[PDB]
Amino acid sequence: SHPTILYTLLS
Amino acid sequence: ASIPHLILELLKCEPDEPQVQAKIMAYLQQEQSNRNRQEKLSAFGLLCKMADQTLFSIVEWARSSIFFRELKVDDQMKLLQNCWSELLILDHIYRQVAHGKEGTIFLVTGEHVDYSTIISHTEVAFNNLLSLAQELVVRLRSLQFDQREFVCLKFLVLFSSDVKNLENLQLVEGVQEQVNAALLDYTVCNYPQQTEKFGQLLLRLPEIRAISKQAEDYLYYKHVNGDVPYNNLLIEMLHAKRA
Numbered sequence: 001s002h003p004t005i006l007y008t009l010l011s
Numbered sequence: 012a013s014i015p016h017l018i019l020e021l022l023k024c025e026p027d028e029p030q031v032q033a034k035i036m037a038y039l040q041q042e043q044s045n046r047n048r049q050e051k052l053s054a055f056g057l058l059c060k061m062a063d064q065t066l067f068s069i070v071e072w073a074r075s076s077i078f079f080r081e082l083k084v085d086d087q088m089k090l091l092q093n094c095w096s097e098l099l100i101l102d103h104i105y106r107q108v109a110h111g112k113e114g115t116i117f118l119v120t121g122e123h124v125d126y127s128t129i130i131s132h133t134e135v136a137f138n139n140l141l142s143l144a145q146e147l148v149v150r151l152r153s154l155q156f157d158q159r160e161f162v163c164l165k166f167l168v169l170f171s172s173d174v175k176n177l178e179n180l181q182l183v184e185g186v187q188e189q190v191n192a193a194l195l196d197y198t199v200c201n202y203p204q205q206t207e208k209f210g211q212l213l214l215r216l217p218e219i220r221a222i223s224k225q226a227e228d229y230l231y232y233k234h235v236n237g238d239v240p241y242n243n244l245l246i247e248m249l250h251a252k253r254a
Contacts (some may be wrong), residue, residue, distance in 0.1 A: 001251065003088050005107050005243050009070050010091075 013197040013200050014159065014183045017193040021162040024070065024076045029121075035064045036120035040095055056240055057060075059230070062099060064244030065119045069098045070244075073169060086177050092251040096223035097168045100144060104219070106162045107148040116141075136229055143222050147215060154211055155202060163194040168216060 038121060041059065043052060073079050073091060082090070102119075110117045114126035126145070130138050170186040177183055198208040233239050239246070 003092065003247065003251070005247050006070070006088050006091060007084065009067070010074060010087050 015196050016195045025155045052076035063245040066244050093174050094168050095248045100223050148218045
């Protein structure tokens with residue numbers, strides 16, 4: 001998975 | 012004012028409604044405005060579009076929230092992937108309870124769109140969901156559901172202990188106990204005449220859940236056949252598990 005957009009938003 | 016510290020802290024993390032309805036609203040004009048006619052501007056699809064925007068907003072709210080901001084990115088992603096549709100539904104609901112009326116839907120942009128209308132330009136499977144959501148609105152309107160209670164439910168939906176593989180499980184379970192106690196303290200102290208507002212409020216979460224489940228299935232079904240534009244966030248979230 002490694003949630004892309006959510007990651008960009010959370011980091 | 013008979014308002015527990017925790018809740019006041021939770022209220023400071025809330026966004027400023029107007030500035031959010033403006034931003035999103037704008038984004039939509041900035042949308043249509045471009046492809047003036049060639050593409051797909053149907054009804055339903057417009058909803059998904061805002062739902063996707065309402066979503067970035069939820070992520071933003073959570074990212075700056077008092078306890079959530081202390082979790083590592085992995086856990087933040089797990090908690091958000093587990094409740095993204097519930098937060099959407101809750102959000103839509105609290106908006107109707109605080110700014111809705113008779114048979115009119117108050118969208119996240121600030122636009123009212125007569126319940127009657129919405130039901131005539133959408134399929135029944137969608138109509139049924141919206142209506143399921145509107146039943147809660149009625150109940151919550153009768154319960155005098157207020158903002159202070161609304162923020163407590165957001166945290167109860169976000170900080171679920173039923174999520175597995177969390178690095179910091181203790182924290183999530185701590186927040187959860189911190190909020191329940193706060194919501195109880197609040198509702199009895201501020202609505203003492205209403206014997207079980209507290210119990211009643213919590214009974215709503217499994218209902219919000221069961222609705223987000225049907226919601227996701229509908230969305231997924233509409234996506235498997237080009238009936239959903241594209242929302243890197245809507246669809247992404249939607250594919251966290253999918254079965």
